[PDB]
Amino acid sequence: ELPGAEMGKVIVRFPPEASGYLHIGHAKAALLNQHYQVNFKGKLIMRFDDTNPEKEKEDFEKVILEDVAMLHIKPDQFTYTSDHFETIMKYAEQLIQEGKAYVDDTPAEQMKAEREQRMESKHRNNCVNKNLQMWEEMKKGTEYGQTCCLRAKIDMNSNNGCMRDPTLYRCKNQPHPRTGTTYKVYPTYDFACPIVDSIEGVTHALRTTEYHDRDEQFYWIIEALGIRKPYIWEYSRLNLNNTVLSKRKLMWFVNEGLVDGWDDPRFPTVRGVLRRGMTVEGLKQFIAAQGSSRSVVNMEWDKIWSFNKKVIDPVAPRYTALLKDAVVPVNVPEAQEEMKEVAKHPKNADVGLKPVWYGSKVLIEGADAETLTEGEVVTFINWGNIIITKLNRNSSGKIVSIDTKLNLDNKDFKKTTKITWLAETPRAPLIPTVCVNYEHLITKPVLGKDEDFKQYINRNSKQEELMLGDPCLKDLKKGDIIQLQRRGFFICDQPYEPVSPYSCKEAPCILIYIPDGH
Amino acid sequence: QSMVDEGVAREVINRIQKLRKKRNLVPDEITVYYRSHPEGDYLDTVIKEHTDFIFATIKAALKPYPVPTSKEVLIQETTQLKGSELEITLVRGGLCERVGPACSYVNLKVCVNTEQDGVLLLENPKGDNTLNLTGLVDAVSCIFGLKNSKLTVFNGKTELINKTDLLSLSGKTLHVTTGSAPALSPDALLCQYINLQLVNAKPQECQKGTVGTLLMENPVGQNGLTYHGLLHETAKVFGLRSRRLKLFLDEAETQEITKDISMKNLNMKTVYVSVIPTTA
């Protein structure tokens, strides 16, 4: 919950940077923000942080709006940091004119040295007029202004590095995507953020606990300017095992070709994670269950998948896929070709019915075949009890064929083995399907500090298996979540396509295994 | 006088490489097209007889006009030489060697209700998804719009069996009828086609081969392949439907196949398929 929060009067913002793709960490922040917006009937600002005309591009902006849409997040307002450039500049000039900010031409590396050694720069005590003259050089973009930055005059002696006169503004002759060349001077995030949260009316600024040092800085700027003070609510950063979240680390997988790209189902981007079979609601319930916790736990991926498994289980239709290579033909001579409709779901009659086809020519898993004995009563799922009569083997002792007798008046289902099966009939041809299983990209769950993820790359993180699918799979569409009986939950990544005139082959239904929490 | 004509051929050669130096091009796969306007006159004679010599010292090929509508012109100069006018155009990438179909195929004459011509690839990519007689009948039914209506496949005058090895008939023409061997077998594929060579990456969806073939029409004159269709079908062949693909006319990857290519240009050419990361 939120201190200082009133119904209808909460205002939160999600302020990504459009430097790349949203990942599950950004997903948490956006969903936590949305949670407070919905539960308090407040407003959610989606603010592009475009303080930097060099770290953003129009390219990731669109990406980011799609990711937010995919999370079913509907911001009430869309703003940019650049929308307030004018006002931010004026607050900088206010601080200069009050001795609270000065301009420094000290080269950056020396500047970080002195900042490191609690050493005041030569400029800290400049009179207002000399500061205003150097500030003029940055505004005009002169080559001398370009080496100058505006610093806040706080405390070079603070334990809080973030308080040792932080840079508020820099001079970049760069043209800006939305403001063009109006400004040769650009505020830092540290400086822009408290101001824009105050302007836009933000009552609760959610930051990850890793920003905690900057809260002191945040509030100094607010007070030094004397403006609306937003409340900072701190939630724990998402630490997932076997997982890295840094763009520079994720990028290495892309560049090394270990991964398909940013929407790869092994990536923790929201794109990849949804492709993997995570649902928004499963994500939404996981965030809500731990809410605003400040303890930075090492989260296990399984704990999210268990929340997801609860969401898809009640509604995912059940279908059958058999491992193509090992399938064993079964003779059911008494059976006639017919079709009956049968429940798609074992506990929720809402999901509806599927057609099942029966006939004398049937296929079962080789793994199941090798566990059968002659004279055993076996339940063929959605059919009934069938007596195994002959197990036909070849010269090597491999079952190559199974003969059966129907036993459908025997309605005893207590101790029978219950196996999946598919009929071979031209009236309902089997659908070629590929099952894809993904593993983690990093084999070590928790990296200690000073440890390099590149030593624990999983080089076998994708496996594909060729299946004979349920005829109903031909109508799956990308995104449909289903259950392969006795195998698990799967999401359709690519649908089946009928024989092409150009390639003379079908395209298989591609199903990705959805981790369930075990 | 052959040393006189060789010295003129060297002047064309010198003309060509000065153009290479104009576009900062450094030996860069290129092609050189030429036109000596007073046709068959002196300078045109020289350049044709000495084409091997020119090719040997300018390590690019030397074909005459016209430049393909598909290639991007690097430079185009017209100067004079020994009473002819001499047009040189330099274009990116080497040539486009036409090759036979990479996958085993079968020409199809389908006489049920008129005669229809087409091709059926028996594998795709090469080495995978090899076809059964039953698979062939199904494929013929989908593509040609037939029901499994007493559908009989004839190799010449024999009828094929669920045991016939279709691959061993790879060059041949088969007859699909309603149960009545025909009378009366072409050589060339009845349909335009392209070959596909995967270069960047390995096929997925448990496929295996790195070379494939796409017909550009099936049956003949029906179902013209479009540019966007080629992208999708390329992906289907190798199991790269999730991936972003770039198609190139050379293996150097400099003549990129583009949405304003003319599809007929591609016929019998090997298209080179490159997988790139899905970024934004």
Residue numbers in the entry:
A (entry chain A): 189 to 706
B (entry chain B): 980 to 1006, 1008 to 1093, 1095 to 1165, 1168 to 1263
Can I see the authors' text?
Aminoacyl-tRNA synthetases (ARSs) catalyze the ligation of each amino acid to the 3’ hydroxyl group of the cognate tRNA and thereby establish the genetic code for protein synthesis. ARSs assemble into a multi-synthetase complex (MSC), which is comprised of nine ARSs (arginyl- (RARS1), aspartyl- (DARS1), glutaminyl- (QARS1), glutamyl-proryl- (EPRS1), isoleucyl- (IARS1), leucyl- (LARS1), lysyl- (KARS1), and methionyl-tRNA synthetase 1 (MARS1)) and three auxiliary proteins (ARS-interacting multifunctional proteins, AIMP1 (p43), AIMP2 (p38), and AIMP3 (p18)) in vertebrates. IARS1 is one of the least characterized ARSs in the MSC. It is a class 1a ARS and has an UNE-I domain at its C-terminal end that is formed by tandem ~90 residue repeats. The overall structure of GgEARS1 consists of an N-terminal catalytic domain (acceptor end-binding and dinucleotide-binding domains) and C-terminal anticodon-binding domain (proximal β-barrel (Pβ) and distal β-barrel (Dβ) domains).
While we could not improve the size and quality of the crystals, we determined the structure of the GgEARS1–IARS1 complex at 2.4 Å resolution using the Pohang Advanced Light Source X-ray free electron laser (PAL-XFEL). The first β-grasp domain corresponds to the KH domain, whereas the second and third β-grasp domains most resemble Ub or the UBX domain with a rms deviation value of 1.8 and 2.0 Å, respectively, for 76 Cα residues, which we termed UBX1 and UBX2. Upon packing, a wide groove with a width of 15 Å, height of 10 Å, and depth of 11 Å is formed between the first helices of UBX1 and UBX2. The UBX1 and UBX2 domains both directly interact with EARS1 via the groove between the inter-helices at the obscured face. A total of 2429 Å2 of surface area becomes buried upon complex formation. The first interface is formed between UBX2 and the helical subdomain (stem-binding domain) of EARS1. The second interface is defined between the two UBX domains and the extended hairpin loop (22 Å long, residues Tyr684 to Pro696) of the EARS1 Pβ domain. At the tip of the hairpin loop, two conserved Ser (Ser688 and Ser691) and one Tyr (Tyr690) residues are present. Although Ser691 is not involved in the direct interaction with the UBX domains, Ser688 makes contact with Glu1216 of UBX2, whereas Tyr690 interacts with Leu1198 and Asn1206. While mutation of Ser688 or Ser691 to glutamate retained the interaction of EARS1 with IARS1, simultaneous mutation of both residues dissociated IARS1 from EARS1.
